[PDB]
């Protein structure tokens, strides 16, 4: 079925639903002072495709899955940057490693450990910068 | 936990590491409190039979959510603190897709929250000693 959780983040920009993956192959972080965008390459149904999440700004940090590598956590911090609740900080875990948080702005914390599963995508919101910041959660 | 998803382990890595395993229902929750969480007790129904797990340790003031027919835990949220040596739960709270429960605990710490907009919280794990350490749940649709 469909296992959604989160959303953590403010209200503000337009909201954006990836779906699930079949397999999520890299994804890329791009923050300042707070998290402006994510980009999530994934492999759906034969298909690679590609979505850009969040502003334009920023500074890239990629996360490349090798084999039989996933997602199992991602945890960051809301914030209220120059006015408006957004993801200052963001950072993912593989099952190998752990990276970031990314972006220098902190704010409430919140955090995903996954005993058992993994993600499977995103959803949430953006704008001039990354505002909200969800996921799917597969077995 | 054959296709289970299970998300957390929110606390510390103190007392002993507990499981309730998924349950096919959850009947009701009572949330033990005093200045921290004291310990979970959960009422749910497995297999046919009804079953209790006591989860925690076993101070605090109850606090209990009975989920009616039709009504399920969509939200868990908290916060982990330090108390007098130990990190374990000062505050923990549940949201129903009709109601919010708590948080119950008096210690602050860093928080964290579970809200949950597609599926609901169908088991309970963690780690549990004096009180309760930590807290992770199982998902599904």
Redesign the interface.
Known sequence: ????????GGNGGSAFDMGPAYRIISVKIFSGDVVDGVDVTFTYYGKTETRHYGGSGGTPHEIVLQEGEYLVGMAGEVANYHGAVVLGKLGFSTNKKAYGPFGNTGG??????????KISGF?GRGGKFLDAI?VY???
């Open positions: 079925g469909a296992i959604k959780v989160g959303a953590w409430t914390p919140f955090s995903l450990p996954i005993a058992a599963g959803f969800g959660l597969e077995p």
